[PDB]
């Protein structure tokens, strides 16, 4: 599985403007063997950016 790392082309996070973007991967049962996504955090807890 790919190492988690800072996002590339993150964009804004309008609902939580100073949230942190991380590219986060987890092993999963698909063609790749894992699924990655952008995860945004504020004070170490996950948040959503758009409504």
């Amino acid at each position: 599985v790919p190492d988690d790392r800072p996002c590339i082309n993150p964009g804004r996070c309008p609902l939580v403007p100073d949230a942190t973007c991380t590219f986060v991967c987890k092993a999963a049962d698909n063609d790749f063997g894992y699924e990655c996504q952008h995860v945004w955090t504020f004070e170490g807890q996950r948040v959503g950016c758009y409504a």
Binding site: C7, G11, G48, Y50
Partner: protein, 302 residues
């Protein structure tokens, strides 16, 4: 079926079946296509008649899966409509004039995913060639300044627009049905959160030709909504009231001849955000219903 709790996709679908069974002359559950993973897209059609040009209103919910208050408000609304027909004169005359189509779960795959894997999942669950990131934002996928400012080219983004307009079968299904059926006069899209009632445009600062009327109608609806428990909403065009957003559903609706195009951002204002507790479902649904009726009364009267 406890309308004051959140439910699985299967339970919501079953309750829609129960509603059409309770009121067969008024409500019918209709399949309009399927999701990426082959779950049915179900709408309820509420209708007292038929005509080649009979007007209709579309009520859209749950396009973004994590916005649980939207699907919950939608299923309660289905029950409210059949409960109040021929009792409340307002919804009765509305239904005597026009059809109401209601889609409580516009993104079924995402919804199941929020209950099995990731509570904050927003997008569809379609594949992205060459990428380990899954899904597109179904509310950036419509043919309304598609891929314009207000979306992302990155499959890993919350706001990925997809490879082309209507790529997402969930969206294509709604677009196809609305285009083929015709005569839609309203399109209302239920999201959360922020307590906003907005109208076009999201893709541009340009003023909608009907902006003055839509703003007036929206402010009336917000006042009706506040009458229940004092919940305050802001009103305005999407781009300047929340943020730029391209390829969104109401902009498509409005650019394709549907005049009364509105987005609701339901409760709350950030205390719970997307994780709104179940105990606010009924209060939210009741107040939202007064807002929806206000919009639909105006549709009826124009």
């Amino acid at each position: 079926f406890n309308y004051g709790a959140y439910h699985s996709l299967e339970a919501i679908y079953h309750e829609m079946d129960n509603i059409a069974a309770d009121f067969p002359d008024l409500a019918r559950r209709v399949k309009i296509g399927h999701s990426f993973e082959n779950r049915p897209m179900y709408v309820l059609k509420f209708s007292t008649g038929k005509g080649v040009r009979r007007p209709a209103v579309w009520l859209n919910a749950g396009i973004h899966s994590r916005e649980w208050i939207s699907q919950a408000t939608a299923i309660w609304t289905a029950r409210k409509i059949v409960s109040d027909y021929q009792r409340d004169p307002a919804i009765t005359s509305i239904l005597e004039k026009m059809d109401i189509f209601l889609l409580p779960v516009a993104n079924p795959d995402g919804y199941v995913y929020t209950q099995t894997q990731n509570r904050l999942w927003r997008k569809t669950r379609s594949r992205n060639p060459g990428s380990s990131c899954i899904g597109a934002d179904p509310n950036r996928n419509w043919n309304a300044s598609f891929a314009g400012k207000g979306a992302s080219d990155n499959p890993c983004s919350e706001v990925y627009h997809g490879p082309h307009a209507n790529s997402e079968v969930e969206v294509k299904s709604v677009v196809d049905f609305i285009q083929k059926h015709g005569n839609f006069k309203g399109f209302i899209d239920l999201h959360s959160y922020s307590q906003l009632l907005m109208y076009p445009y999201g893709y541009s600062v340009k003023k909608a030709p009907d902006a003055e009327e839509l703003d007036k109608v929206a402010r009336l609806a917000a006042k009706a909504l506040a009458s229940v428990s004092g919940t305050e909403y802001q009103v305005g065009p999407t781009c300047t009231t929340v943020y730029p957003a391209s390829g969104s559903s109401i902009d498509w609706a409005y650019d394709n001849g549907i005049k009364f195009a509105f987005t609701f951002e339901l409760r709350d204002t950030g205390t719970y955000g997307f994780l709104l507790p179940a105990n606010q479902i009924i209060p939210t649904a009741e107040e939202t219903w007064l807002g929806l009726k206000t919009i639909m009364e105006h549709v009826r009267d124009n």
